[PDB]
């Protein structure tokens, strides 16, 4: 499972941002989720059901692949959850559908601080919210 992580990262212009993969300046609608080529992705891809879920590299058939997203055949099949977020190869946060459940609360997940560094000082709360007709428990990060 671990090497279903695409790890194509190049600090390039912005320096230092890649440290956030390991450890710890501040609005148009996103496009819908599609099939993302793994070669553009650096680190884990998260989708939100609204609860956070990691999506690993597959081929275009959905068959899992285990080559750290290094191949042209490596993709993320994101079209189904409500949205997804990831870091691209040069350090830009990408969204499709961030995972805001409230104007001031975001879904919390292991790479929130890397993908959304301007939420560093938000507080984590155990919350419950109605999505469709389905109650969900999750952890959220709020102003």
């Amino acid at each position, epitope marked *: 499972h671990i090497n279903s992580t695409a790890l194509n*990262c190049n600090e390039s212009l912005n320096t230092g941002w890649l440290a956030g993969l390991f450890y710890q300046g501040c609005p148009h609608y996103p496009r819908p989720c599609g099939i993302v080529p793994a070669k553009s992705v650096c680190g884990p891809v998260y989708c939100f059901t609204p609860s956070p879920v990691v999506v690993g590299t597959t081929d275009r058939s959905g068959a899992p692949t285990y*080559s750290w997203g290094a191949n042209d055949t490596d993709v993320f099949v994101l079209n189904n959850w409500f949205g997804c977020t990831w870091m691209n190869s040069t350090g830009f946060t990408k969204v499709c559908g961030g995972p805001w459940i409230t104007p001031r609360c975001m879904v919390d997940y292991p790479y929130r601080l890397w993908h959304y560094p301007c939420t560093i000082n938000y507080t984590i709360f155990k919350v419950r919210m109605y999505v469709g007709g389905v109650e969900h428990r999750l952890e959220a990060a709020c102003n």
Partner: antibody
Amino acid sequence: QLLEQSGAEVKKPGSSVKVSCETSGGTFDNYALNWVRQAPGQGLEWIGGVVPLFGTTRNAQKFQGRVTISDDKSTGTGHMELRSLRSEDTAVYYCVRSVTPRYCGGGFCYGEFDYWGQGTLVTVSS
Amino acid sequence: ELTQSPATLSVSPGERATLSCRASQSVSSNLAWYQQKPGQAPRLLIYGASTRATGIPARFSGSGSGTEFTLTVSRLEPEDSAVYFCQQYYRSPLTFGGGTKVEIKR
């Protein structure tokens, strides 16, 4: 930050040696442990390294199959085991730790070497 | 693979020392310089071809990109007697230059 390596060693050809790399204070934030050696009169040669978060390793070709590099994230103690020692392996071995990664490519990461151990002389002799 | 020429340098205190690293193939800016004083481990001076590492005096300065790189020590002092190695982290395997040993005149 100070890296402290185990003391010098002497080994018969064909034997194995394990060198340790301990951090003076507590552990600190670093993403890779690598090992670098220097023949007594010569320059610097990269052996290999490990990125513990992903559990990946790279080795130079001269060491393919006989080196195991590992890192204890709880204690902050790293290790290089070198097997099948030959006399050409006599060298000062250096532990190095890197803090800020500069590029990654599946599934290993690379950058400058921030911190160096003081070095461990390993002599291989009959 | 990295070439440092000349392998030795002999320079007077107060003057400027210029060291050369040539890569056989582009390494872009993924190049570091280290200093190894007698009997000590190397210490990092420069990374990303031109960025000074923390705690390094400003008279150490790097430049270059691609295949041609230069470490400049301005106003040499006795403590700078050392071997200086370049190193590239552009592609695997990581490689080091052979070193230039700087002697300080007196």
